[PDB]
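Q: Here's a chain of 262 amino acids. Please give me its 3D structure as tokens.
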Amino acid sequence: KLAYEKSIEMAGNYANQFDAQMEANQAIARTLACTMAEYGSQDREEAMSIIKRILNENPQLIGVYLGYEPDAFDGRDKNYINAPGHDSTGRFVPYCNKINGPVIIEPLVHYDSSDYYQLPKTTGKDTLTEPYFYEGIFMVSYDSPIFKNGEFAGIAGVDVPLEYVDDVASSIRTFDTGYAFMVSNTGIFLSHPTQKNWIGEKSLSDFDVEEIKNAASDIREGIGGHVEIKDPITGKTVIMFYEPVKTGDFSFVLVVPKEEML
């Protein structure tokens, strides 16, 4: 009980440690969105220089981007069809990034259907995607709607790689063999000390174990808690403590062998 409470606080502590940098990342996209909502100068090259500077000043990001509705940045998509950083629409959709090493700007893709654009568009709200792999890079995307004259004009977003999560989480130790990992709001592993292959690929809700499914429900709803999980075949019990990460309701999880705690 002294053991559980201390573990509850430690999980909460780490959850908020990860949360802090996420709030900062979210604030970058949001402030870029506020700024572009007031931006009347219509200078595409200048807007691409602004996103490239924000990228280069934030080493924890891998992409900074804007994507606009037809003609909503400067009324002139027809003049930018297939220009550098554009596609065949001429919409202003520059994705400034260093996914492949060097910084380049190429057009966003799937903005007519993918959540990073469509959720801001239909909800009017800031959003954080679930984690995914793109071109070999494990990441999430934070996006904020740009409102011009009270109408949705497009989004400002930042892509955030998550490799550092496993670097940090998988070296956390508690008691004798207690360990830690982070998951996303739908329970997708962002880290794991031994199963690198679960990262980005498996979810808590995939485990055929009542207690783990129950943890994943709470996690989905932003709820902290703990469960006791007994392995009938090894006889070993662990306690799995999970505490919400407030930005996106991800979750920081500590797993502790019950005997070590008493």
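Q: Can you summarize the key feature?
A: The chain is about 30% helix and 25% strand.
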